[PDB]
Amino acid sequence: AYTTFSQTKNDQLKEPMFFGQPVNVARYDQQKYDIFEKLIEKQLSFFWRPEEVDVSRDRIDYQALPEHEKHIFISNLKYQTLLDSIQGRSPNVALLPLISIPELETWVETWAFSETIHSRSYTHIIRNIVNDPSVVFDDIVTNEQIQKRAEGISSYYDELIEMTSYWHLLGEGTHTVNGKTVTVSLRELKKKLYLCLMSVNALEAIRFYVAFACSFAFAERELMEGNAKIIRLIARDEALHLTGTQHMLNLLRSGADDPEMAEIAEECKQECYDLFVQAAQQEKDWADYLFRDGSMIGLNKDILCQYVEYITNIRMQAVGLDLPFQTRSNPIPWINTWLV
Amino acid sequence: AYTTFSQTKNDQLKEPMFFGQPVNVARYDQQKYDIFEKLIEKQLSFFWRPEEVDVSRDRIDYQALPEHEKHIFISNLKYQTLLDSIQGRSPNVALLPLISIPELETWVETWAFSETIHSRSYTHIIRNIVNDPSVVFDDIVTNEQIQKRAEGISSYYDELIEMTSYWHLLGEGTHTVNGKTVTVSLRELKKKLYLCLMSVNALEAIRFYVAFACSFAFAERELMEGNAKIIRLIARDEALHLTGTQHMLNLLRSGADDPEMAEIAEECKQECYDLFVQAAQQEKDWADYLFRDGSMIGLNKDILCQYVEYITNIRMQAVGLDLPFQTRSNPIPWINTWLV
Ligand SMILES: [Fe+3]
Ligand SMILES: [Fe+3]
Ligand SMILES: [Fe+3]
Ligand SMILES: [Fe+3]
Ligand SMILES: [Hg+2]
Ligand SMILES: [Hg+2]
Ligand SMILES: [Hg+2]
Ligand SMILES: [Hg+2]
Ligand SMILES: [Hg+2]
Ligand SMILES: [Hg+2]
Ligand SMILES: [Hg+2]
Ligand SMILES: [Hg+2]
């Protein structure tokens, strides 16, 4: 059963990252994995407030944009809002109840908080460019293409949370709930956590990239420069997040943490592969919806597509997976000046 | 029946603060209660890092304190570490799954985040004054004197968490679970939230204050000044947190947010009064503890206790509870030079 302050005096240095005794004393004088303490310090050094980025000229530039280019900017904004909305609460609600080491507990919390800063920045941009934000915010949940092309995300979290609840209440075994047989197994829960983690990783590694590239393309035609400065900050935060999920996944893979997680990573390898491939496809589909009731001059659905492939391969290899796409060179190296 | 992104387009202004549809889109262009957005704003403007306050000279001051003064300083730090260890994690684990308005959702992740900074600050202090932090950190979990408070506080959050889990897993009704009858009633669930929210108010309202007082007592004496600087940053954050729980409680009690909550607030009165008083008495016994070995210069058990009584009456009144102690002027006006 979960407790906010476990009463057993435990050596936190020997607990696994997940499924061990809930964290009791939050101390930062020692760590099982210093990478997490490093990441917290770095995120705290990058603290920024949106409020401090002038975006007044952007309302002018935006007003002057062709409808087709406006739809691209708005749509991306709507998409980033969906993601960061989910990224703000999810790590806290889904992982926090499973963490067993303090450095990771605090990291998750610092990471989810920085996502809320991102959310706030969208509000800042939006209310500075459109005379009524509700048009944008109200077409999110309903936008059939955002929900369609971003199908699967709440899914991994939602099932994990439900499973976690059953396990925290009932414990392992086969039970009878309202006449129904329900089986609770930790190994299964670990698979659910592992794949959730691999999906967050995909989200962090690839999902923002086509948005960033659009935003940045605008900045290269010398337009939407305040937005661009914000996206620059956001991207720098996402790089830390990703570095943090890659490490978690890789440490889990090495078998140096919980040994059962090393068997699970291996047996799930094919699903890891498929979800990444599914995500790439989703981004590619997004690429069309954007390059729809028109397009752009400097970029197009094919260029986007090449880039999504370019990036997905880099990212999959970082986590030890096989490459699904043909190897190519970055198709828009100009993005590199704005990145990380 | 909890999701990280509800698919129903809903009017977020019309939703209650808790137990409504889970929050989908995080937008901050509008709010049902401006207070929570204001709170997020101040807390961000107050951002600070413990690392930038120099604690080095505090080493010689602590080393030179009389032994029983070292016990007071340390026990206090231990107690503060306990409270903030619970406060970094809890609000997120306990409230997030029940919030239905975005501003509240965000404020709760910002609030909890600022508390991780407080715990980080206690390691910074501890690290800089003793040689082995493990001596401090390993005597909190099982230290008898601290322990009682921990159990009392955790309890409220824990029962709330468990009932929330059954609620979201099975919904209301009389259910069977392995031969056992289990009744789930939202009325009762509301009752448990009100009470845990009441105990956190007492926690922010009064339990930290007595620790502050002792910290500030040394500062008045020109001792342990780095610590005193950090504690001043901490008490400034605490004032905002309390402002939050006070507002939440008052909104609930007035029936303005959820009519049923006004009924629950009245049914619950005596017990809220009993809990605040119980909290106050622990602080007193805690003071009697601290000063068993003799007063520190400038502060003593009796004054402290008068101080608890004085602050309690204030806090209580603020949340419409009867005053349990005889009215008095603040017995240690000098604390105001350090608080706000
Ligand atoms: Fe983000
Ligand atoms: Fe992120
Ligand atoms: Fe605090
Ligand atoms: Fe606090
Ligand atoms: Hg996850
Ligand atoms: Hg996930
Ligand atoms: Hg699997
Ligand atoms: Hg894998
Ligand atoms: Hg509580
Ligand atoms: Hg609470
Ligand atoms: Hg003291
Ligand atoms: Hg009550």
- Rg of chain A, C-alpha, whole Å: 21
Residue type, B86: I
- CB-CB contact of A301 with A295 (8 Å): yes
DSSP letter for each residue of B283-295: HHHHHHHHTTS-P
State residue A337 phi and psi, 5-degree precision: -70, -30
A19: left (phi over 0), alpha (psi -120 to 50) or beta: left
**CA A103/CA A135 separation, integer angstroms:** 41
Cα–Cα distance for residue pair B104/B35, rounded to 1 Å: 9
What is the arrangement of strands in the sheet containing A180-184, beginning at the earlier edge strand? A180-184, A173-177, B173-177, B180-184
Please give the Cα distance from A60 to B182 (Å, whole number).
61
User: Shortest CB distance from B25 goes to which of A90, A97, A140?
Assistant: A140
Please give the Cα distance from B335 to B308 (Å, whole number).
13
Domain that holds residue A199: 1-340
> Which region holds residue A132: left if phi is over 0, alpha if psi is between -120 and 50, else beta?
beta
Q: How far apart are the first and last CA of chain A?
A: 41
Whether B111 contacts B99, CB under 8 Å: no
A229 sits in the region (left: phi over 0; alpha: psi -120 to 50; else beta) called: alpha
Chain B neighbors of A123, CB-CB under 8 A:
27-29
* Contact status, residue B250 vs residue B206, Cβ threshold 8 Å: no
Measured distance CA(B50)–CA(B227) in Å, rounded = 10
B79 CA to middle of ligand 12, Å?
26
Nearest CA to B4 out of B34, B29, B26, B36 is that of: B26
What is the spatial distance between Cα B151 and Cα A197, in angstroms, rounded to a whole number?
A: 33
* Structural tokens at position B26: 């995080």
Would you list which residues of A are annotated within the binding site for Fe cation?
Answer: 84, 115, 118, 204, 238, 241
B84: nearest Cα among B198, B208, B192: B208
Query: What residues contact residue A114 under an 8 Å CB cut-off, 6+ apart?
Result: A43, A237, A241
Q: Please confirm, yes or no, whether B122 is among the known catalytic residues.
A: yes
DSSP class of A97? G
**Tokens linked to B322:** 């009867």
Compute the distance between CA of residue B121 and CA of residue A27 in angstroms, rounded to an integer: 10
CA–CA gap between residue B137 and residue B157 (Å, rounded): 23
Number of H helices, E strands in chain A: 13, 2
Q: Position of tokens 């009463």?
A: A7
List the resolution, Å.
Answer: 2.2
Q: Under a CB-based contact definition with an 8 Å cutoff, are residues B312 and B280 in contact?
A: yes
Residue A181's H or E segment, with its range, is strand A180-184
User: Which residue numbers in chain A precede an interruption (C–N > 2.5 Å)?
Assistant: none
Q: Which amino acid is at B96?
A: L
Does A42 touch chain B if contact means CB atoms closer than 8 Å? Answer: no
Inter-chain CB proximity B82 and A175 less than 8 Å: no
Q: Nearest 5 degrees, angle CA A333-CA A339-CA A340?
A: 135
In one-letter notation, the amino acid at residue A7 is Q
3-state secondary structure of A65: coil
Q: After which residues is chain B broken (C to N over 2.5 A)?
A: none
The answer to whether the beta carbons of residues B21 and B8 sit under 8 Å apart is yes
A9 reaches B (C-beta below 8 A): yes
The number of residues in chain A equals 340
Q: Which method resolved this structure?
A: X-ray
Contact A254, A19 (CB under 8 A): no
Task: Tell me which DSSP letter residue A67 carries.
Answer: H
Tokens 């008495």 sit on residue: B281
∠ CA B135-B140-B143, nearest 5°, is: 105
**Cβ neighbours for B157, distance < 8 A, ≥ 6 positions apart:** A4, B86, B90, B93, B94, B196
**Residue A178 backbone zone (phi > 0: left; psi -120 to 50: alpha; other: beta):** left
Structural domains of chain A, count:
1
CATH number of the domain where residue A304 is located: 1.10.620.20
* Secondary structure (3-state) at B340: coil
